[PDB]
Amino acid sequence: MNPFHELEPGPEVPEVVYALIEIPKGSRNKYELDKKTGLLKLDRVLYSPFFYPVDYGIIPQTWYDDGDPFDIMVIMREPVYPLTIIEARPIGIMKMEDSGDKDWKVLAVPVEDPYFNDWKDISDVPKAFLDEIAHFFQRYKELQGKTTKIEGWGNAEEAKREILRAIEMYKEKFG
Amino acid sequence: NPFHELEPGPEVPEVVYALIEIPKGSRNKYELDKKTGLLKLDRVLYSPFFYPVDYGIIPQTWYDDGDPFDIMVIMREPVYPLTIIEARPIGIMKMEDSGDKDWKVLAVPVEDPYFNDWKDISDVPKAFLDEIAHFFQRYKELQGKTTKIEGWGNAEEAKREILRAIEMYKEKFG
Amino acid sequence: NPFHELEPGPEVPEVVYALIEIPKGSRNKYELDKKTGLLKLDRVLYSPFFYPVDYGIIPQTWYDDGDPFDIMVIMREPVYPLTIIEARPIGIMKMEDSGDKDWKVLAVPVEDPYFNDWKDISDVPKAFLDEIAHFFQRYKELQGKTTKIEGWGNAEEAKREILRAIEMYKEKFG
Amino acid sequence: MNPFHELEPGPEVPEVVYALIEIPKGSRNKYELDKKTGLLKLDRVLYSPFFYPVDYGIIPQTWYDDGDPFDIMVIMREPVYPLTIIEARPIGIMKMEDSGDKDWKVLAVPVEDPYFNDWKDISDVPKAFLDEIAHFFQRYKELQGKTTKIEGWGNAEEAKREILRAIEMYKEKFG
Amino acid sequence: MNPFHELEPGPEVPEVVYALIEIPKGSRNKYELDKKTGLLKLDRVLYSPFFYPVDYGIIPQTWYDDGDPFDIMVIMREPVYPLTIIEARPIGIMKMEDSGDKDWKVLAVPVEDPYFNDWKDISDVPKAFLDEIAHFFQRYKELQGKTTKIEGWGNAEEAKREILRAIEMYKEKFG
Amino acid sequence: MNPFHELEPGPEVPEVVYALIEIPKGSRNKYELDKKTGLLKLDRVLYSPFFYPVDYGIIPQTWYDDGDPFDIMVIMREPVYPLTIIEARPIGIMKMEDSGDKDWKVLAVPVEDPYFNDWKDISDVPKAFLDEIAHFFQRYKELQGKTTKIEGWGNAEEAKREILRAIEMYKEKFG
Ligand SMILES: [Ca+2]
Ligand SMILES: [Ca+2]
Ligand SMILES: [Ca+2]
Ligand SMILES: [Ca+2]
Ligand SMILES: [Ca+2]
Ligand SMILES: [Ca+2]
């Protein structure tokens, strides 16, 4: 069974969504979901000594403008294992373009860690942390000759808007 | 869902399967999603405690608290979530959590020769039993929940409860 | 011995040195050997709890409990024991341990821009303060010791106590 | 169901095969796929304080002379998680017998780590590294009283021929 | 200052000794104390994928027949850092010869971990654990062409005897 | 006191030098020796989620054009602890400028890991690995607004000449 197709986008969209984690914070290995089988697959080893600064994954049953499931980054104190489901509250969105593709990514916090109880919008995140995430996506494919453009951060309302768009796109492509 | 498809064990109740959800050393509490059988984050423990054992469930069991029967396996090196271990029950922790009978089997892996002579609760260092009981006594304290630890039962008692849980599953499901 | 040779800080009490003894995530409790200044195992915590912060002492301080003044530094990645960190005090945990005044400074590292806007106790998520207090409330429970947590003071109060501890050191030693 | 039966042997066999990893480098726990459910299973804890020196798994849809799927060892700088699929280039083969059975193992490098771009055959591997792998397999079951015999290393050409034979054996026995 | 010369052999010799740890359990790197300076030094990387099964170090102010400080192995649940002092209770001794040298090693438990409160003699240790330690020292230098002979285990009384011998030897060589 | 002043530059300079490690591979924390006490000090947390790709330290009793001890990078398979001494063979040198200062760094392999026995010059290192190290230094201070310039790599001969120059500079400035 392919988790991407079988799980709902979340229990209370768009206030609480499911994040299906593919890459735990601290990994230099970039994993993806195998399209056919739903197994974890190594996509590549990052060409530079950078690590994913957040737990990284996808929202099930979404589709985005770049022709992939919609990506979500979840701030976890202790990283989870790949293929773990996290109930996540979206708090913002990173706007960026990768080789002409709109490759925006939702930023979210776990609902069930009380540490983040007061994080509800992009302004609640330390600025240095946002910069470190943006710098990662700006440079992580530099040695592969790819250029990415970081366009800035959007707030929680914008993230939620985009999640609803992505859910609709999925329904139109597969349903 | 691995909970339904796997047998309770290759030689019940002397050897059961433990389906591990939480490796020793984790502060994240994981459970199985009941719809899909994927691992799911239940919560992050509110206190800086870590699971002192690999923690999971015995497949095709059901217990008084309306959940699969819990099992704790002592592993020298923790396994990954969703790993099956063949485990020998050596005892049982008796506890209530918010008025529900929430007993948990203590077990050792059959395939680690380190534990070959552990066969009953008396073979476990007492400081180690204390640390496990203390974990369950306090790990939900900041969530305002009360747990009562009632003590430890021996291997025979553990095995009786396993048989009871295997029967309860058959009733409720088929 | 690093405790005696290092100054209390480059800009007391706004910036102090923390000499780390125990990295976050350790179950082993380390201290400095007073004769040699080497790291020494004090004990293994009796319960499966881990230090929720990097834990150490402020050099050339002394406190009411007859020890160097304790400091807890919030580090995203833990450091190695015997590492010096430049730390900004943002608060103070008030607690008694077996009748001794055992207060501990809470601090953030100056050189991690993540914490640039943490300047007082109100900037810390309350769940995090709770988890620290809970650790010290229960970590010696199985050793039969009682600790009393009296609450948190703010940055100004922390800095006053640091000045007091720096003076106490000068009295007792030279 | 069971990734061993559902996945193809590789996207471009035998030049590029899939390695389905069961044991990450650094593990003292020896895991195997439960061939009923396809879940990871603990087979044993190694009796000696040795760790797997490579990420160890099987090639899907293969069968070998010893009556199990064909083993593959992938050199990863950062170990992956169990049940991860890696696209791998075979560069050689370890010839060994375990309890009288032909228990040969493919040695491979990941296609998507540029570090190994110039590793194409067995002669590209540091000799000390080949020795460490062989010594592990020579001794890891010694306290269990089993005997293994290390017969040496074959080159990439030989490894690829054996992969094709294993693919054929699977077809005859199941397909 | 050199810790080997400055620290006493222990607070209550031979019932409780100091172990100055050089190698934490799980390390493949073999560290030693630099003779001149007392700093940690890499001696070698073990040639095989084996890890030290115990925290490993020396007793300060001792000298043994093999012309080195007397070695001690401490069973720790969580490994310590190098150059950490542990108050340790000797419970046995491993008898072995390395290239003609008597290279016996004390086995000990930490006084301040209540897990080991009842471990007082060699018979309290699981047999499989003793075997795993012995197998490690039997084979860890095999690829270096060295042969070691394991002669067996002695009890707590014998360990204590040897500690007293080693303390006296030190006094005669340096004092 | 201060290992930087007490230790010799190496046992057989410039063929074999001592590397005194300050930062283990994998660290995002940047450590430096406190030049008053010789204790390890946190200099900064890197502003970006990058990790040191090598074990990083200094050669004792050296001084360089940028007014600090000469930097050395040691390739270790398993990282060591801070303040560990490694006997290292120089195989090359990274030429770079940091804020207008000549901040060149020796690249070296450990003498006592047989894995690197055949690494003797810069051409023996996989090109992707040299690129990853250079990219780290090109970008690791970008969010601090500092600029570094990577000028390329020199061979073992050049590295050894620079080591001798640094040893001489130390003598003139302190000795
Ligand atoms: Ca995308
Ligand atoms: Ca239960
Ligand atoms: Ca105190
Ligand atoms: Ca085989
Ligand atoms: Ca010896
Ligand atoms: Ca420099």
How is chain E split into domains, by residue range? Answer: 1-175
Q: Does any CB of chain E come closer than 8 Å to the CB of residue C30?
A: yes
Give B79's strand partners: none
Residue type, position B36, single letter: T
User: Helix, strand, or coil here: C143?
Assistant: helix
Tokens 């929680």 sit at which residue?
A156
Q: Is B51 left (phi over 0), alpha (psi -120 to 50) or beta?
A: beta
DSSP A36: T
Stated as kind and residue range, the H or E segment containing A139 is helix A127-139
Q: What is the resolution of this structure in A?
A: 1.9
Cβ <8 Å between D118 and F126:
yes
Q: Counting ligands in written order, which one lies closest to the CA of residue E148?
A: 5
In sequence order, what are the residues at sequence separation of 6 or more whose Cβ sits closer than 8 angstroms to the Cβ of residue E108?
E17, E19, E72, E73, E74, E75, E88, E89, E90, E91, E159
B163 φ, ψ (degrees, to nearest 5): -60, -40
Q: Does any CB of chain C come closer than 8 Å to the CB of residue F27?
A: yes
| Sign of the CA dihedral with D129 first, then D133, D138, and D141 last | positive
Tokens 């002979």 sit at which residue?
E149
User: Helix, strand, or coil here: D84?
Assistant: coil
- D14: preceding bond cis by omega (within 30 degrees): yes
Question: What are the structure tokens assigned to C99, written together?
Answer: 């009748």
Judge whether B132 and B72 are in contact, CB under 8 Å.
yes
User: E strands along E6-161, which residues?
Assistant: 17-23, 29-33, 40-45, 55-58, 71-74, 85-98, 101-102, 105-110, 148-155
Angstrom distances, CA of residue C22 to CA of C40, C70, E32, E80, E85: 11, 11, 23, 11, 14
Chain E CB contacts of B25 below 8 Å: none
Q: Is E22 left (phi over 0), alpha (psi -120 to 50) or beta?
A: alpha
- What is the distance, to the nearest Å, from the Cα of residue A27 to the centroid of all Cα atoms in its chain? 15
Distance from CA of C13 to the nearest CA of E (A): 31
Angstrom distances, CA of residue F141 to CA of D30, D152, E175, F135, F145: 42, 48, 53, 11, 7
Q: Counting ligands in written order, which one lies closest to the CA of residue D22?
A: 4
Q: Which of F139, F141, F144, F146 to mutate to test the interface with A (most CBs of A within 10 A)?
A: F139
Residue type, position E127, single letter: K
Q: Which fold has domain F1-175?
A: Inorganic Pyrophosphatase (3.90.80)
Cα F10 from Cα F163, distance rounded (Å):
10
Check contact C-D (3+ Cβ pairs < 8 Å): no
Give D110's strand partners: D88
* The domain made up of C1-174 is a member of CATH 3.90.80.10: yes
Q: Which of E44, E81, E82 has its CB closest to that of F112?
A: E44
C-alpha A112 to ligand 1 mean position (Å): 25
Q: Residues for chain F: how many in total?
A: 175
The residue among E124, E139, E28 whose CA lies nearest residue D47 is E139
Report the structure determination method.
X-ray
User: Helix, strand, or coil here: A90?
Assistant: strand
Question: What are the structure tokens assigned to B145, written together?
Answer: 């929940």
Distance from CA of A117 to the nearest CA of D (A): 31
How many CA atoms are closer than 13 Å to the CA of C119, on its beta-carbon side?
3
